[PDB]
Write an enzyme that holds these catalytic residues in place. Structure first.
Site, PDB file in Angstrom:
ATOM      1  N   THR D  47      33.373 -83.485  27.180  1.00 18.13           N
ATOM      2  CA  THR D  47      33.984 -82.509  27.629  1.00 18.13           C
ATOM      3  C   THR D  47      34.670 -82.359  28.550  1.00 18.13           C
ATOM      4  O   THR D  47      35.237 -81.549  29.130  1.00 18.13           O
ATOM      5  CB  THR D  47      32.096 -81.737  28.881  1.00 18.13           C
ATOM      6  OG1 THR D  47      30.553 -81.343  27.094  1.00 18.13           O
ATOM      7  CG2 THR D  47      32.643 -80.483  29.318  1.00 18.13           C
ATOM      8  N   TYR D 135      24.645 -92.609  24.461  1.00 17.73           N
ATOM      9  CA  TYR D 135      25.063 -90.495  23.636  1.00 17.73           C
ATOM     10  C   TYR D 135      24.780 -90.657  21.638  1.00 17.73           C
ATOM     11  O   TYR D 135      25.386 -90.959  21.252  1.00 17.73           O
ATOM     12  CB  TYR D 135      26.616 -90.183  23.990  1.00 17.73           C
ATOM     13  CG  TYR D 135      26.721 -89.321  24.184  1.00 17.73           C
ATOM     14  CD1 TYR D 135      25.935 -88.094  24.112  1.00 17.73           C
ATOM     15  CD2 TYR D 135      27.636 -88.530  24.007  1.00 17.73           C
ATOM     16  CE1 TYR D 135      26.403 -87.015  23.249  1.00 17.73           C
ATOM     17  CE2 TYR D 135      28.321 -87.088  24.053  1.00 17.73           C
ATOM     18  CZ  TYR D 135      27.193 -86.339  23.332  1.00 17.73           C
ATOM     19  OH  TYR D 135      27.994 -85.097  23.440  1.00 17.73           O
ATOM     20  N   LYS D 163      21.961 -90.424  25.774  1.00 13.98           N
ATOM     21  CA  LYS D 163      21.430 -88.256  25.685  1.00 13.98           C
ATOM     22  C   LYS D 163      21.490 -88.467  24.876  1.00 13.98           C
ATOM     23  O   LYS D 163      22.298 -89.042  23.718  1.00 13.98           O
ATOM     24  CB  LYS D 163      22.892 -88.685  26.799  1.00 13.98           C
ATOM     25  CG  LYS D 163      23.516 -87.009  26.355  1.00 13.98           C
ATOM     26  CD  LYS D 163      24.265 -86.865  26.654  1.00 13.98           C
ATOM     27  CE  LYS D 163      25.618 -84.832  26.633  1.00 13.98           C
ATOM     28  NZ  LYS D 163      26.680 -84.385  26.139  1.00 13.98           N
ATOM     29  N   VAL D 205      21.527 -84.584  30.158  1.00 16.30           N
ATOM     30  CA  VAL D 205      23.068 -84.146  30.587  1.00 16.30           C
ATOM     31  C   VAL D 205      23.611 -82.399  30.302  1.00 16.30           C
ATOM     32  O   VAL D 205      23.944 -82.754  29.104  1.00 16.30           O
ATOM     33  CB  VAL D 205      23.536 -84.863  29.721  1.00 16.30           C
ATOM     34  CG1 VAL D 205      24.933 -84.901  30.393  1.00 16.30           C
ATOM     35  CG2 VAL D 205      22.521 -86.586  30.315  1.00 16.30           C
TER      36      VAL D 205
END
Ligand SMILES: [K+]
Ligand SMILES: [K+]
Ligand SMILES: [K+]
Ligand SMILES: [K+]
Ligand SMILES: [K+]
Ligand SMILES: [K+]
Ligand SMILES: [K+]
Ligand SMILES: [K+]
Ligand SMILES: [K+]
Ligand SMILES: [K+]
Lengths: 292, 292, 292, 292
Positions: D47, D135, D163, D205
């Site tokens: 992001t 992740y 995550k 998250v």
């Protein structure tokens, strides 16, 4: 407004030694389920081997289940198929033997459009005074009933609920949001019972409730109570047991598991087969490990 | 050994204004197909709206088609369903009205295992003296008939071919590789006719042959003669036309397309619907693009 | 117009015992490929472990390969990444070392739009006078370069080809149809070489050519001469060998298979690992089964 | 044990008009997030446009965010790439500028095995004394970190959380169950926050926290209290808002939404593009429907 409660059971159809419907065993099963946390019964659905039952068998089964239940819980008959005209006919016949509602699956095999499904469901609902529960199951019918199609259908007076087996709680979320308070969204996947209810599902249309219905009611109560750790521990059991019931095509594992716990309901009809010995050993170990 | 040729047509079932089988229109359609490159006819399959035909309608339809065909091309009946017992029953009934072979689809909706499907197809094939064509269609039935299951089935004497609508020429390759020379693989996807024949497929079980049968015949003759340029140009047409025929649920577009070229076969049964005006005009533009 | 021929090889990067580029072994590999059916070499692509090569190592590899190849076949540098600015930089560096073209992959990881990818490829193509090959690889980048986006890009003068690893010969067909004759479509999947060429693909960008390059050219020649039984047999072999090369993450298998045929090209960099013993036994069996 | 709280935020990287990092806007954004329910900041992740930041930009960005944050919430740096050696280097550099933890994504593009990923994450974790969050993002990297692999990794002292953007609360359930109490599972999808927490996830998250952090904070407080009606009401908003932020390639929508509410964080770097006027109007209409 009809109330199916938190656990509608997708009941297996017991068969006798010759593979015919065993009504005595059906009586035992129905009474067991009602005493073990089942709040509504779906008769002759996918788990009830609807594909291999004749129309005459379906109606005899619906009638027997209605008789035994004697209004203790709602009885939902799986009358919908991928043929609209046939679905109307079977719905009429189920109505005549006193069922309380009908379950209408997204047409499988012929891959209808959203508007086709709308007209399909609309035509069947119009033909009966009974409440209708829709059944979204892309895992079996390939197509999805879109959120917008579900919403449009929810505006029809007797379309009162949906079993959503799409495996997606975010589409469930939107259905819950955009339909009226008197339209109920059920999970169609045992493992998602807890997270589906967290987002506003009324309950579960269950396979695992055949063998851990008490534990499931305990989990739902605990969650509703705010007892997250208690609910989470029972959720872990539910996921484990559910998974063991779908390692071979359903309903073959759950029928064998019922037999293992003293409720023999016979075998399955082709193209389904009995468990192999290796499959049976694996399942039995899971069943034996359920806390008692 | 029965020869279905290069283009077996998955024939639509013509209906009258009220959705009944139109036997007179069926007579016209059968004659039209045979005069337009069709080398075998599949009757009452998916494209023939099998889901919305009764068993009695299917048999009446098989009988009529047998009569009209008068042994000019093989007649294949779509007798297989997701119920083994019912499939044996309908297969017997089709055999008795003089069809030449049967098509058996992978059971939809109930999601059988590989071994379940093996026993399903074995049981049906042993119930008839007629040749059997298997039908792999995961895009409608969810399950795939695995390469190994197909190879096993190919060893059964009257299981002689497969319509593979799995959309994968590499799985077709392996089936072609691992089965005897007298077992034929057909594409079940019109667009893949050329590449499937390149890897060893015998031909196509076609929908687009309803409107570009002659062009398809020309394309196959070109490919078989090593004229790859000529074939590729006709292949581009076939892909374009085929895609336009599946923008709404089939068989609705091909029925609409047939009406455009002067062969009215009526409309469709619920849960299928007529094309919208938007859909019709989109289809018409592609139909208009066919060189005349 | 640049001619990559029928078999562009996605060349592995030989490493020494310390994991550094082995320049002598790279020279040996290059000469081997040129003598075994390779008509163009892709240097520093996915199969060449671009993700684990430093920028400096990529350019050095480009330099060395250019010098060894000595204009015998075109040299294509894998300069494109998911970062447009970085891709421009690396493309300019490759241009200065004297490669003949650049390969530009669809950006992975960041999931760009069709228009984003258009601008990405346009900006990179702008930065060099060299010919550019697009690389559609949704199996690694998730996104597809749409047919319409490829057509737009084909209108840019130095964008002359696409490597299509989308696995869909029907999208390839559309690209072939809608682009000019001087825009080439290559298969990016070894298994699809035959069917792709049947629908008009110019050739293959290959991994299997490291070990069966001669058999691949033999297949292509047999197909082109209408020798279909011969072509189909070699096709079946190509499919089988290719599949064995991707059971563990590429390029690890093909590096091991090279060593099996007497071209040691070292091991792989993390996060890639050597084959397990079980994996090596599986691959070895396939390699020793190849008819030579 | 490091505590990331219930709402970690996957922070965008503000750019100036020349596309360079805007440090003053970053300061504004960091302070805004901390006052709007953010309990931990992930810096330079997906992001934050990690693919288009240079290593030097990343380290400057980490250093600045560490400075502004001033130990008020944990700073997690996105140091993992698909190159293990490079990931160790950047992890060292992040550690040197005082971040509190690092985020390590499943390698994208090169499609590593389970054991490859195990060795990858193990090696990076070994290189730093800092806590590590894994992740899982199959929607960008294709591969998944299997439950088994996550459990094995959780046994490494400094690998403390994951995550999970796999979209599957049932794999989350299993990870939660099979790992120690001091290993935390975070949802990696905003819409799943509530159902993930229902099965025992610690939190989210988040991307939506850039615009509705206070709403998400109230949602979680209501949920944890057991007021499911209000929690479900805010969940509906979260899902709606989140969907609108991913209609174009993220992070471009969330950056634009930030600009719409007076926190201009600039545009995006190629291959990402600004929203079209049409995309902007669509986003604006959803943003304007957020209750104020
Ligand atoms: K209603
Ligand atoms: K509702
Ligand atoms: K046979
Ligand atoms: K064969
Ligand atoms: K063979
Ligand atoms: K060009
Ligand atoms: K072309
Ligand atoms: K062309
Ligand atoms: K740990
Ligand atoms: K845990």
């Amino acid at each position: 407004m009809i109330d199916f409660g938190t656990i509608a059971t997708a009941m297996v159809t017991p068969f006798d030694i010759n593979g015919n419907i065993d009504f005595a065993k059906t009586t035992k099963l129905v009474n067991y389920l009602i005493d073990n946390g089942t709040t509504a019964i779906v008769v002759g659905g996918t788990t009830g081997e609807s594909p291999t039952l004749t129309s005459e068998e379906k109606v005899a089964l619906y009638r027997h289940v209605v008789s035994v239940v004697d209004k203790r819980v709602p009885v939902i008959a799986g009358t919908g198929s991928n043929n609209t005209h046939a679905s109307i006919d079977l719905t009429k016949k189920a109505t005549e033997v006193g069922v309380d509602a009908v379950m209408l699956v997204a047409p499988y095999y012929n891959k209808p459009s959203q508007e086709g499904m709308y007209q399909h469901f609309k035509a069947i609902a119009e033909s009966t005074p009974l409440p209708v529960m829709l059944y979204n199951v892309p895992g079996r019918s390939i197509v999805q009933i879109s959120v917008d199609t579900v919403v449009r259908l929810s505006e029809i007076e007797n379309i009162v609920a949906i079993k959503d087996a799409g495996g997606d709680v975010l589409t469930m979320t939107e259905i819950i949001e955009k339909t009226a308070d008197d339209f109920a969204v059920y999970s169609g996947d045992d493992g998602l019972t807890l997270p589906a209810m967290a987002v506003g599902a009324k309950g579960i249309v269950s396979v695992a409730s055949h063998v851990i219905g008490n534990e499931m009611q305990e989990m739902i109560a605990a969650f509703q109570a705010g007892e997250f750790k208690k609910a989470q521990k029972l959720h872990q059991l539910l996921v484990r047991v559910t998974d063991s019931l779908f390692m071979a095509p359903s309903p073959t594992p759950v029928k064998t598991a019922l037999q293992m716990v003293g409720l023999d309901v016979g075998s399955v009809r082709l193209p389904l087969l009995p468990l192999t010995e290796e499959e049976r050993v694996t399942l039995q170990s899971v069943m034996q490990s359920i806390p008692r």
